[PDB]
Design a protein around this motif. Structure first.
Motif, PDB file in Angstrom:
ATOM      1  N   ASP A 270     -27.257  25.329  49.033  1.00  0.00           N
ATOM      2  CA  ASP A 270     -27.699  26.653  49.385  1.00  0.00           C
ATOM      3  C   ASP A 270     -28.748  26.571  50.781  1.00  0.00           C
ATOM      4  O   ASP A 270     -28.038  27.220  51.252  1.00  0.00           O
ATOM      5  CB  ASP A 270     -27.610  27.119  48.509  1.00  0.00           C
ATOM      6  N   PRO A 271     -29.892  26.070  50.182  1.00  0.00           N
ATOM      7  CA  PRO A 271     -31.389  25.933  51.068  1.00  0.00           C
ATOM      8  C   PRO A 271     -30.873  25.050  51.842  1.00  0.00           C
ATOM      9  O   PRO A 271     -31.809  25.661  53.401  1.00  0.00           O
ATOM     10  CB  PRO A 271     -31.408  25.246  50.327  1.00  0.00           C
ATOM     11  N   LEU A 272     -29.597  24.690  52.336  1.00  0.00           N
ATOM     12  CA  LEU A 272     -29.126  23.516  53.357  1.00  0.00           C
ATOM     13  C   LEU A 272     -28.367  24.517  54.550  1.00  0.00           C
ATOM     14  O   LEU A 272     -28.410  24.767  55.834  1.00  0.00           O
ATOM     15  CB  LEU A 272     -28.691  22.520  53.787  1.00  0.00           C
ATOM     16  N   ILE A 273     -27.180  25.507  54.006  1.00  0.00           N
ATOM     17  CA  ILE A 273     -26.696  26.528  54.511  1.00  0.00           C
ATOM     18  C   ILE A 273     -27.141  28.475  55.222  1.00  0.00           C
ATOM     19  O   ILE A 273     -27.554  28.940  54.878  1.00  0.00           O
ATOM     20  CB  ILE A 273     -25.496  26.531  53.388  1.00  0.00           C
ATOM     21  N   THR A 274     -27.515  28.259  56.647  1.00  0.00           N
ATOM     22  CA  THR A 274     -27.807  29.054  56.833  1.00  0.00           C
ATOM     23  C   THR A 274     -26.709  29.723  57.292  1.00  0.00           C
ATOM     24  O   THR A 274     -26.622  31.545  57.748  1.00  0.00           O
ATOM     25  CB  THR A 274     -28.493  28.968  57.870  1.00  0.00           C
ATOM     26  N   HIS A 275     -25.578  29.551  57.541  1.00  0.00           N
ATOM     27  CA  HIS A 275     -24.962  30.579  58.404  1.00  0.00           C
ATOM     28  C   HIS A 275     -23.278  30.052  58.195  1.00  0.00           C
ATOM     29  O   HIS A 275     -23.145  28.091  57.957  1.00  0.00           O
ATOM     30  CB  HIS A 275     -24.565  30.220  60.546  1.00  0.00           C
ATOM     31  N   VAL A 276     -22.218  30.721  58.443  1.00  0.00           N
ATOM     32  CA  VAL A 276     -21.001  29.942  57.991  1.00  0.00           C
ATOM     33  C   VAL A 276     -19.941  30.565  58.448  1.00  0.00           C
ATOM     34  O   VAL A 276     -20.591  31.969  59.099  1.00  0.00           O
ATOM     35  CB  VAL A 276     -20.622  30.361  56.264  1.00  0.00           C
ATOM     36  N   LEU A 277     -19.532  29.913  59.713  1.00  0.00           N
ATOM     37  CA  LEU A 277     -18.191  30.572  60.912  1.00  0.00           C
ATOM     38  C   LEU A 277     -16.833  30.171  60.842  1.00  0.00           C
ATOM     39  O   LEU A 277     -16.708  29.137  60.291  1.00  0.00           O
ATOM     40  CB  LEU A 277     -18.964  30.017  61.659  1.00  0.00           C
TER      41      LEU A 277
END
Ligand SMILES: NC(=O)c1ccc[n+]([C@@H]2O[C@H](COP(=O)([O-])OP(=O)([O-])OC[C@H]3O[C@@H](n4cnc5c(N)[nH+]cnc54)[C@H](O)[C@@H]3O)[C@@H](O)[C@H]2O)c1
Ligand SMILES: NC(=O)c1ccc[n+]([C@@H]2O[C@H](COP(=O)([O-])OP(=O)([O-])OC[C@H]3O[C@@H](n4cnc5c(N)[nH+]cnc54)[C@H](O)[C@@H]3O)[C@@H](O)[C@H]2O)c1
Ligand SMILES: CCCCCCCCCC(=O)O
Ligand SMILES: CCCCCCCCCC(=O)O
Ligand SMILES: [Zn+2]
Ligand SMILES: [Zn+2]
Ligand SMILES: [Zn+2]
Ligand SMILES: [Zn+2]
Lengths: 374, 374
Positions: free
Chosen positions: B343-350
């Protein structure tokens, strides 16, 4: 009773680049605290001493060069504990202070007291023990072995076996230990591997000895002087190649020969182009290339970092990665026990007074190691 | 049923360099012998995909890019034994044939069947499964994940845990495994060591995670974008430095900070200059520097080989040195067992339809990983 007195003796002084050594009288000061004065018995002619003459290895001139040697302690300064007068010793061009972060590290040998990374040509205290014609003369790598007597820091000398033949074990002070260690310690050559060795001089023949000791299945010697191939085969090369024989670059030849690249390659010449060739010829995913040759001063190489991205390892080392003062006495003990041979490296013997003739033999391509006797 | 039929689906086609992706209908042929057709579930935006747009990573165009992904097997060609329809899978941009000299070597992962060293943009059989507007479209690294459906060779796919969350474990297909492996497998970071990480994007943050997992005492993050520093500290950086803040070159700053050079440095950017800076900042006798960033096509760096001769190790790797098909399922199992965080790598989910907006987030410095969902 020369103890505490200035000694007048003969040395080979280098006054200027690209000139013969001058064999003439110098004054050697007595040892200060933690210094050792050594009566030299034998010294080898290493290509790095020639690089000083060529000006491609930069150190302050005028200088007493020489770093591959063995002698007998004449006197010790106050506080010395690791040698005594009459001990047989090898000067250590890579010191081992035993105190710095590198000496404490399990895999470091490039001790922070070294005079190699930024040569000053002095003792540890930043002065010289050598006068000639009333002028101060530089030391070289804290050793200066082209002299009947030298003075070294205690961290730059190792006591060796009292029964050591000094006219052989002087090679443990540079070329044998450097090449052998580059194979067994730095590369960690594996059993059944394929190795390529660029340069078949004293140090490259010692790399071959180390590859063969480590059990390599194939050891390919590379040299532009085909006269070097017979001795390379004697000490373990399974095949030799001269780049001049081929239309294709030798990295492509060696990649073909090894069915996709070698396990281990060694640059043992000192050229930028062969450093890049030697990296390219190792297998792209798991190959290891070791730089041993000393490149020309202040020159950068150009390379494609994609050679590394695929998986290659590129590294270099001084003195075969050996911690000098721990390792040299053990290497002598192993020589005494017949664990390796030095005679294949010794092609010529001369008295010290014929030092210039010894350099001419190296420059002509005729010699591997000439050993000079005092 | 779609099995054995051409699928018409949506994909992001790159028709030429330095243009937006075109989101349009493509035709995806059924899998041939030893091929696997995958319904994509999630794919990450990796800088390497942007480098294809920039023209600094060369691969044949037009292309379906994308290589960091996860999906579900739709159908298998004749002879497929390692996945079945309905399995969750990660495409492997580094294949694992299991048969070549690299796959058989204990330390190699750059399988000779790769489409990385001389990209052709095809299946193993030298043909394409994609057409668009009646033109054949290239594959990318044997993956091509910017498509609702792709076809990959069996050696380019791994089965993963049926319960894994594909919107997170897609990062095990590139960024996480690359960074983590670069620290724990390629460098072999040691307990109590000091590490320097150049570039604090998704791969550099994964390098930090691995250095922390390996027990490094100090992890110095280096980035010109100070907005990256907060997240670098969350995942284990002990300090962060911006080279733009200093009058002196950052190799000098990092040598001083680490009292003579770091144990391990990592280049995780893809610039020639930072590759040399990263090597220089590691300790001269025993430091290790790893190249992770992808350097610009056909450009050589310039460096002083004395940096290596003192004892440095310089090495690079693809995909963190992991043998891809053995490692990917184990990494997913370890994630499911909470051995590391994604999760710390994921900033955006599109949604996938916002691929261009996702690339603009990366280019602007705003994002770490955007995950596109099909
Ligand atoms: N790393 C260390 O601690 C260390 C120690 C000792 C020597 N050195 C260096 O190691 C190198 C070899 O020293 P050495 O064995 O005494 O020297 P050497 O006896 O001159 O051997 C070098 C060999 O390289 C050959 N050669 C020259 N040019 C080429 C070429 N272009 N292509 C292929 N072969 C070529 C040459 O014919 C010769 O046989 C020199 O650079 C030394 O300065 C490094
Ligand atoms: N070896 C592999 O298998 C592999 C896998 C994945 C990615 N890559 C490469 O790794 C690199 C990083 O990928 P990523 O993390 O997705 O990229 P990213 O998210 O763009 O991160 C790169 C970081 O570098 C920073 N940066 C840019 N220029 C400088 C500079 N001059 N000095 C210091 N910092 C700077 C930048 O601000 C950014 O935070 C790229 O070159 C990729 O192509 C390699
Ligand atoms: C040595 C050839 C390397 C080609 C690298 C192609 C991109 C790999 C994936 C990535 O870097 O994200
Ligand atoms: C890392 C700088 C070292 C350059 C000088 C090396 C000279 C040592 C003696 C030798 O090579 O025979
Ligand atoms: Zn020391
Ligand atoms: Zn030498
Ligand atoms: Zn393979
Ligand atoms: Zn990637």
């Amino acid at each position: 009773s020369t103890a505490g007195k200035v000694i007048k003796c003969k040395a080979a002084v280098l006054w200027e680049e690209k000139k013969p050594f001058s064999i003439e009288e110098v004054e050697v000061a007595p040892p200060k605290a933690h210094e050792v004065r050594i009566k030299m018995v034998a010294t080898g002619i290493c290509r790095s001493d020639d690089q000083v003459v060529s000006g491609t290895l930069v150190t302050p001139l005028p200088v007493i060069a020489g770093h591959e040697a063995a002698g007998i302690v004449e006197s010790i300064g106050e506080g010395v504990t690791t040698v005594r007068p009459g001990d047989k010793v090898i000067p250590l061009f890579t010191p081992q202070c035993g105190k710095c972060r590198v000496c404490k590290h399990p895999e470091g040998n490039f001790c922070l007291k070294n005079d190699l990374s930024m040569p000053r040509g002095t003792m540890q205290d930043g002065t010289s023990r050598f006068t000639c014609r009333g002028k101060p003369i530089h030391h070289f790598l804290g050793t200066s072995t082209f002299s009947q007597y030298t003075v070294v820091d205690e961290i730059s000398v190792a006591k060796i076996d009292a029964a050591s033949p000094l006219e052989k074990v002087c090679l443990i002070g540079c070329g044998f230990s450097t090449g052998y260690g580059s194979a067994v310690k730095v590369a960690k050559v594996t059993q059944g591997s394929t190795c390529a060795v660029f340069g078949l001089g004293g140090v490259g023949l010692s790399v071959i000895m180390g590859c063969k000791a480590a059990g390599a299945a194939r050891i390919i010697g590379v040299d532009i002087n085909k006269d070097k191939f017979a001795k390379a085969k004697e000490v373990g090369a399974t095949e030799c190649v001269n780049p001049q024989d081929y239309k294709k670059p030798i990295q492509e030849v060696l990649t073909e020969m090894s069915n996709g690249g070698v396990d281990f390659s060694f640059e043992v010449i000192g050229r930028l182009d062969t450093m890049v060739t030697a990296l390219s010829c190792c297998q792209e995913a798991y190959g290891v290339s070791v730089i041993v040759g000393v490149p020309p001063d202040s020159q950068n190489l150009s390379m494609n970092p994609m050679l590394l991205l695929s998986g290659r390892t590129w590294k270099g080392a001084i003195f075969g990665g050996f911690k000098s003062k721990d390792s040299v006495p053990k290497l002598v003990a192993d020589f005494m026990a017949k664990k390796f041979a030095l005679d294949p490296l010794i092609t010529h013997v001369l008295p010290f007074e014929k030092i210039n003739e010894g350099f001419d033999l190296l420059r002509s391509g005729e010699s591997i190691r000439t050993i000079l006797t005092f």
